[PDB]
Swiss-Prot record, chains A, B, C, D:
Subunit structure: Octamer or nonamer in membranes. Monomer in the soluble state. Originally described as forming tetramer in the presence of a lipidic interface.
Record note on domains: Composed of a long N-terminal alpha-helix and a core region rich in beta-sheet structures. Before the pore formation, the alpha-helix binds the lipid membrane, partitions into the lipid-water interface and stabilizes the monomeric molecule on the membrane. Finally, it traverses the bilayer, thus forming the transmembrane pore.
Site (Important in the initial contact with the lipid membrane) location in chain: W83, Y84
Organism name: Stichodactyla helianthus (Sun anemone)
Family the entry assigns: Belongs to the actinoporin family. Sea anemone subfamily.
Subcellular location(s) of the protein: Secreted; Nematocyst; Target cell membrane
CC annotations in GO: extracellular region; nematocyst; other organism cell membrane; pore complex
Expressed in which tissues: Expressed in tentacles and mesenteric filaments.
Protein name: DELTA-stichotoxin-She4b
Variant or mutagenesis effect after changing Y84N: Reduction of hemolytic activity
Source lineage: Eukaryota, Metazoa, Cnidaria, Anthozoa, Hexacorallia
Binding site for phosphocholine: S25, V58, S76, P78, Y104, Y108, Y109
Amino acid sequence: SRKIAVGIDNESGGTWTALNAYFRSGTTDVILPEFVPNTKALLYSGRKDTGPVATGAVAAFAYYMSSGNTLGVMFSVPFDYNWYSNWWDVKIYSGKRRADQGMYEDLYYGNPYRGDNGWHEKNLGYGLRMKGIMTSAGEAKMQIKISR
Amino acid sequence: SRKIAVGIDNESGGTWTALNAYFRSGTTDVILPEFVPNTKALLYSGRKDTGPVATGAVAAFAYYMSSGNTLGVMFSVPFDYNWYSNWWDVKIYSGKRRADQGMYEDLYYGNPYRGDNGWHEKNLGYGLRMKGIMTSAGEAKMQIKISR
Amino acid sequence: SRKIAVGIDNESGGTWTALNAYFRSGTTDVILPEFVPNTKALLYSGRKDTGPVATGAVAAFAYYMSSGNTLGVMFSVPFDYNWYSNWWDVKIYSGKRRADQGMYEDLYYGNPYRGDNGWHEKNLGYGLRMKGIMTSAGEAKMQIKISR
Amino acid sequence: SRKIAVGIDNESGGTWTALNAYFRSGTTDVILPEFVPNTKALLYSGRKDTGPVATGAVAAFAYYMSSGNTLGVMFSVPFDYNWYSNWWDVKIYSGKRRADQGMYEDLYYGNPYRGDNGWHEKNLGYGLRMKGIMTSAGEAKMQIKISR
Amino acid sequence: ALAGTIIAGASLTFQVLDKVLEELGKVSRKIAVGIDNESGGTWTALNAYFRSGTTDVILPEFVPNTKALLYSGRKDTGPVATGAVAAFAYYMSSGNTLGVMFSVPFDYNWYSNWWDVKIYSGKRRADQGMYEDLYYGNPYRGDNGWHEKNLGYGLRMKGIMTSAGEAKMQIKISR
C-alpha cells in the first residue's frame, strides 16, 4: 500500500508548465496539472500500480517554469522500506529537459532528500529557493515551496 | 479494473459534431456528446468490457469540426500491460471519416503517444494544435486541448 | 447484467402518445410516458428480465405523434454478445400501429443501426428526421432526436 | 419476489371513496387510501412479502365513486410465468359491489388486459372511461387514468 | 485543513484532538498533537524524527502568535510489533529550538506513554539524539495530570498527554 500526494507552491512569480511525469515504478490517477501560476500550488498524486506488485510510486515529473528551466521533482516511496527507503529531490535543470529516465536517476542519486518528515532545504539557483518536505510513511504527503 | 476518462477542449471556434466511437475493445457507459461547442469541453469516457474477459478499453472516436474534417481521437488501455502498453493519439482526417477498425488501426500504428503520463504535443494541422496526456494506470485520464 | 436507457427528444412540432412496448425478451421497469410534448425529451428504460435466464433484452415500443402516425423504436441488447450483438432502429409507420412481434421484426430486420456508439442518421419520412445513437455496453444507453 | 405498484387517478369530476382491497394471496404493505377526489391521484403497493407465498398480488380492489357505482380494479403478477403471466383489468359495477373472490374471478374472466406493457383503453360506461397500463415485470407497475 | 494545520490558540481543545484522531482513521496506536504558541514569535517546523512509527500528515510550518498547530502520528501499518514514538522541532523567532516528543509504544506491558517538551539553544535538528535526550531526560507520563515546567529559555510548557494508546497531546507553550 504505497502512494504519495504532492503539493508544490509556486512563489517564483512566473507561471510554470507541465512537461511529463516519468515513473520508475507505479502510476498516477490524476493528470499532471498544466498551468500553476504564481501564488498557486500544484496538486498532484501518484500511487502504486494496482495489483500484487512489489513496487511503489517511484516517480519524477519535470516542469517548465517561466524562467525556461526544468523543475524536475522526484519522489520514491518504495513498496519495501526494509531494504529501500523513502526519498525525494528537487533539482532545477536549465533550459529544457523532459522528465527523462536519466533525469529521475540524477534526482535520485545526486543528493536525494531523505524521507524523514524533515523540512530539508536547498537553493536551486536562478534566483530560486526550495523549501520542501515529505513523510516516511507508506502513504506519503509532500509539500514543496519553490520561491524566489 | 481498467477505464479511460477523456476530456477534450474545444477552442477551434467551431462545434464538433460527434460521428461515432469505434471500440476495438471495451464499451462506453456515456453516450458520445454530439455537440461540443467552441470554447467548451467534451467529457467522454470508456470502460473495459465487464466480466473476466482479457480485454482493454481501446477506442478511436471521431468528431467533425466546422472546418469540415474528422477529428479522429484514439486511446488504448490494454488488459495485459505485461506485453502491450498504454497508447493514445489524435489525427485530423479530411471530411466525414467514420472512425472504424481502419481509423484506430492507423492511429495506433501511426504516431501514437506513449502513456508515460507525459504531455506530448503535435500540430494537428488545418490550423489546429494539440496538447494532451494519458496516464500509465489501468485508469487513464486525458486532457486533450485542441486549439486554433 | 443487461440494461438500456432510451431517451428520445420530440422536436417534431407535436406531442407523442405512448402506444405499446413489445418485449421479444427482457423486461422494463418504468412505464412509457403518456405524452412527450413539443421540445421535450422522452425518458424510458428497459432491463434484463426478472431472473437469471440466458436471454437478452430486446424490445420495440411505439408512440403516436401529433402528425397522426406511429413512431416505432426498437433496441436489442442481447445476453450473448459473442453470438448476438447490440442493435437499434427507429422508423415511422403511416397511421396508428401497435408495437408487437411483427413491428419488432420489421424494425430489427430492416436497417437496424449498430450499437457502436455512432450518431447514425436517417430521414424518417413524412417530414421527419432521426438523429440517434446507442452504446455497445450491456448496460447500454440510447439518445435519439426526432425533428420535423 | 414480484411486487407491483398501482396508481389510479380520478378525473370524473367527483369525490372518490375507498370501498375495500380484496387480497386472495399476499397482503399489500399499505392499506387503501380513502380520499382521492377529482383532479387527484391514488397510490398503492404490491404483495409479495411474508416469505413463503407462491402466487403474489393476484387480486383486485374495489373503489367507490360518487356516482353510486363502484369500480373493481384487478392486478396479477404471479411468480409463475411459463403457466401464467401479468394480468390486469378494470370494470364498473352499479350500486354496491365489494371486491371479493367472485369479484376477482369476474374481473379476471371478463376482458383481462394482457400485461404486455401496452396502454389499453375502454369506455367504462356510466359516463366513465379508462386508459391503463401495467408492465410485464415481476416488479410490475401500473397507471390508470379514470376520466368520465 | 484539519490535521497538521493551524487554528486559533484558544481553539486548541481535546475535541480537535479527537477530530484529528478520527481523520487519521482506525489504527491501534496513534496520537493527535496540538501545540499553542503563546511565545509571541512565529514558529517554523524543523524536522520530525521517528524512533518508530510514522505520520500520514506533514508537519505544519508557520505557527504565529495566538495560534495553535496540530499534528498526527500513527503506528507503522501491518503486523510489525512497533509503536509510535517520535519527536519534532520548531524554530521560534527568538532563534532557539523548541523540541517536543511523544511516545505511545505498541506494547504497554513493558513500556508506557511518555512525552516531554524542551528548548535547545539555537537551531537544533530534531533527530535521534534530541529524541534520546527528551525520552531519557525528564519525560512526563500519560497520566493526563496537567504537567507544567519551564523550558529553561524563558518559556514554560502548560502541556498534557493521555495514557491511552489513542493519545491526545495538548501543549500551551508560553513565556
